[PDB]
Protein backbone atom coordinates (compact mmCIF):
# COMPACT_ATOMS: atom_id res chain seq x y z
CA UNK A 1 0.00 0.00 0.00
CA UNK A 2 1.01 3.65 -0.23
CA UNK A 3 2.73 5.40 2.74
CA UNK A 4 -0.51 7.25 3.45
CA UNK A 5 -0.05 6.75 7.19
CA UNK A 6 3.41 8.32 7.06
CA UNK A 7 2.15 11.31 5.10
CA UNK A 8 -0.44 11.88 7.81
CA UNK A 9 2.31 12.51 10.35
CA UNK A 10 4.06 14.89 7.95
CA UNK A 11 0.81 16.80 7.50
CA UNK A 12 0.53 17.46 11.23
CA UNK A 13 4.14 18.62 11.32
CA UNK A 14 3.61 20.91 8.33
CA UNK A 15 0.63 22.56 10.02
CA UNK A 16 2.61 22.99 13.23
CA UNK A 17 5.20 25.00 11.32
CA UNK A 18 2.60 27.21 9.64
CA UNK A 19 0.84 27.69 12.98
CA UNK A 20 4.11 28.87 14.53
CA UNK A 21 4.84 31.41 11.78
CA UNK A 22 1.15 32.24 11.21
CA UNK A 23 1.17 34.76 14.11
CA UNK A 24 3.78 36.64 12.10
CA UNK A 25 1.37 36.99 9.19
CA UNK A 26 -1.31 38.39 11.47
CA UNK A 27 1.06 40.98 12.94
CA UNK A 28 1.94 42.40 9.53
CA UNK A 29 -1.63 41.96 8.34
CA UNK A 30 -2.76 44.33 11.09
CA UNK A 31 -0.81 47.12 9.37
CA UNK A 32 -1.32 45.70 5.88
CA UNK A 33 2.09 47.13 4.97
CA UNK A 34 5.38 45.51 3.96
CA UNK A 35 8.27 47.18 5.77
CA UNK A 36 11.12 44.76 5.03
CA UNK A 37 9.22 42.62 2.54
CA UNK A 38 10.05 43.55 -1.05
CA UNK A 39 7.50 43.38 -3.86
CA UNK A 40 9.73 41.23 -6.04
CA UNK A 41 9.90 38.73 -3.19
CA UNK A 42 6.21 38.00 -3.59
CA UNK A 43 6.73 37.13 -7.26
CA UNK A 44 9.42 34.59 -6.42
CA UNK A 45 7.47 33.29 -3.43
CA UNK A 46 4.58 32.42 -5.73
CA UNK A 47 6.85 30.20 -7.81
CA UNK A 48 7.94 28.33 -4.69
CA UNK A 49 4.36 27.47 -3.75
CA UNK A 50 3.53 26.62 -7.35
CA UNK A 51 6.36 24.08 -7.38
CA UNK A 52 5.02 22.45 -4.23
CA UNK A 53 1.67 22.01 -5.93
CA UNK A 54 3.24 20.11 -8.81
CA UNK A 55 5.38 18.05 -6.46
CA UNK A 56 2.31 16.95 -4.52
CA UNK A 57 0.54 15.92 -7.72
CA UNK A 58 3.58 14.01 -8.94
CA UNK A 59 3.89 12.31 -5.55
CA UNK A 60 0.16 11.58 -5.62
CA UNK A 61 0.00 12.83 -2.02
CA UNK A 62 -3.22 14.52 -0.92
CA UNK A 63 -2.07 15.74 2.54
CA UNK A 64 0.94 17.56 1.11
CA UNK A 65 -1.21 19.27 -1.50
CA UNK A 66 -3.75 20.41 1.10
CA UNK A 67 -0.99 21.55 3.45
CA UNK A 68 0.63 23.64 0.72
CA UNK A 69 -2.66 25.38 -0.05
CA UNK A 70 -3.21 26.18 3.63
CA UNK A 71 0.31 27.57 4.01
CA UNK A 72 -0.23 29.90 1.06
CA UNK A 73 -3.42 31.18 2.66
CA UNK A 74 -1.64 32.16 5.88
CA UNK A 75 1.35 33.44 3.95
CA UNK A 76 -0.92 35.95 2.21
CA UNK A 77 1.36 38.85 1.29
CA UNK A 78 -1.26 40.03 -1.19
CA UNK A 79 -2.61 42.69 1.17
CA UNK A 80 0.80 44.34 1.48
CA UNK A 81 1.34 43.97 -2.27
CA UNK A 82 -1.62 46.28 -2.90
CA UNK A 83 0.34 48.86 -0.93
CA UNK A 84 2.34 49.85 -4.02
CA UNK A 85 -0.16 48.34 -6.45
CA UNK A 86 1.29 46.44 -9.41
CA UNK B 1 13.28 0.68 -4.98
CA UNK B 2 12.62 3.77 -2.87
CA UNK B 3 11.15 6.96 -4.47
CA UNK B 4 14.58 8.59 -4.22
CA UNK B 5 14.17 10.14 -7.67
CA UNK B 6 10.88 11.73 -6.66
CA UNK B 7 12.37 13.15 -3.47
CA UNK B 8 15.07 14.78 -5.57
CA UNK B 9 12.46 16.89 -7.35
CA UNK B 10 10.88 17.85 -4.03
CA UNK B 11 14.29 18.93 -2.75
CA UNK B 12 14.74 21.39 -5.61
CA UNK B 13 11.25 22.77 -4.99
CA UNK B 14 11.92 23.14 -1.27
CA UNK B 15 15.09 25.12 -1.95
CA UNK B 16 13.24 27.33 -4.42
CA UNK B 17 10.81 28.31 -1.68
CA UNK B 18 13.56 29.08 0.82
CA UNK B 19 15.45 31.04 -1.84
CA UNK B 20 12.35 33.16 -2.47
CA UNK B 21 11.80 33.97 1.21
CA UNK B 22 15.53 34.03 2.03
CA UNK B 23 15.84 37.68 0.84
CA UNK B 24 13.35 38.50 3.60
CA UNK B 25 15.71 37.06 6.21
CA UNK B 26 18.58 39.17 4.90
CA UNK B 27 16.51 42.36 5.04
CA UNK B 28 15.68 41.90 8.72
CA UNK B 29 19.15 40.58 9.41
CA UNK B 30 20.58 43.90 8.25
CA UNK B 31 18.86 45.58 11.21
CA UNK B 32 19.14 42.52 13.45
CA UNK B 33 15.86 43.60 15.06
CA UNK B 34 12.40 42.02 15.19
CA UNK B 35 9.73 44.66 14.56
CA UNK B 36 6.64 42.48 14.03
CA UNK B 37 8.26 39.20 15.02
CA UNK B 38 7.43 38.22 18.60
CA UNK B 39 9.89 36.39 20.84
CA UNK B 40 7.40 33.65 21.67
CA UNK B 41 7.06 33.00 17.94
CA UNK B 42 10.66 31.82 17.82
CA UNK B 43 9.95 29.24 20.53
CA UNK B 44 7.06 27.76 18.57
CA UNK B 45 8.95 28.01 15.29
CA UNK B 46 11.68 25.80 16.73
CA UNK B 47 9.16 23.06 17.44
CA UNK B 48 7.98 23.18 13.83
CA UNK B 49 11.49 22.59 12.48
CA UNK B 50 12.12 19.93 15.11
CA UNK B 51 9.07 18.02 13.90
CA UNK B 52 10.32 18.13 10.33
CA UNK B 53 13.58 16.55 11.47
CA UNK B 54 11.75 13.60 13.01
CA UNK B 55 9.49 13.25 9.99
CA UNK B 56 12.49 13.03 7.68
CA UNK B 57 14.07 10.33 9.84
CA UNK B 58 10.82 8.37 9.98
CA UNK B 59 10.45 8.69 6.22
CA UNK B 60 14.09 7.68 5.80
CA UNK B 61 14.45 10.58 3.36
CA UNK B 62 17.85 12.27 3.19
CA UNK B 63 16.92 15.20 0.89
CA UNK B 64 14.06 16.31 3.13
CA UNK B 65 16.30 16.22 6.19
CA UNK B 66 19.00 18.28 4.48
CA UNK B 67 16.43 20.73 3.12
CA UNK B 68 14.94 21.26 6.58
CA UNK B 69 18.36 22.04 8.05
CA UNK B 70 19.09 24.55 5.30
CA UNK B 71 15.73 26.27 5.77
CA UNK B 72 16.40 26.69 9.49
CA UNK B 73 19.74 28.30 8.69
CA UNK B 74 18.16 30.95 6.48
CA UNK B 75 15.26 31.34 8.88
CA UNK B 76 17.71 32.37 11.59
CA UNK B 77 15.69 34.58 13.94
CA UNK B 78 18.35 34.06 16.60
CA UNK B 79 20.01 37.42 15.91
CA UNK B 80 16.78 39.30 16.58
CA UNK B 81 16.11 37.12 19.62
CA UNK B 82 19.26 38.48 21.27
CA UNK B 83 17.60 41.87 20.97
CA UNK B 84 15.64 41.32 24.18
CA UNK B 85 17.91 38.54 25.42
CA UNK B 86 16.20 35.54 27.02
From Swiss-Prot, chains A, B:
A single GO cellular-component term on record: plasma membrane
Domain spans labelled PQ-loop: 6-63
Location (main, coarse): membrane
Molecular function GO labels: sugar transmembrane transporter activity
Membrane topology designation: Multi-pass membrane protein
Record keywords: Cell membrane, Membrane, Sugar transport, Transmembrane, Transmembrane helix, Transport
Subcellular location: Cell membrane
TM region positions: 3-23, 37-57, 61-81
Record note on quaternary structure: Homodimer. Homooligomer.
Chain's role: Mediates sucrose transmembrane transport down a concentration gradient.
Name the UniProt record assigns to this protein: Sugar transporter SemiSWEET
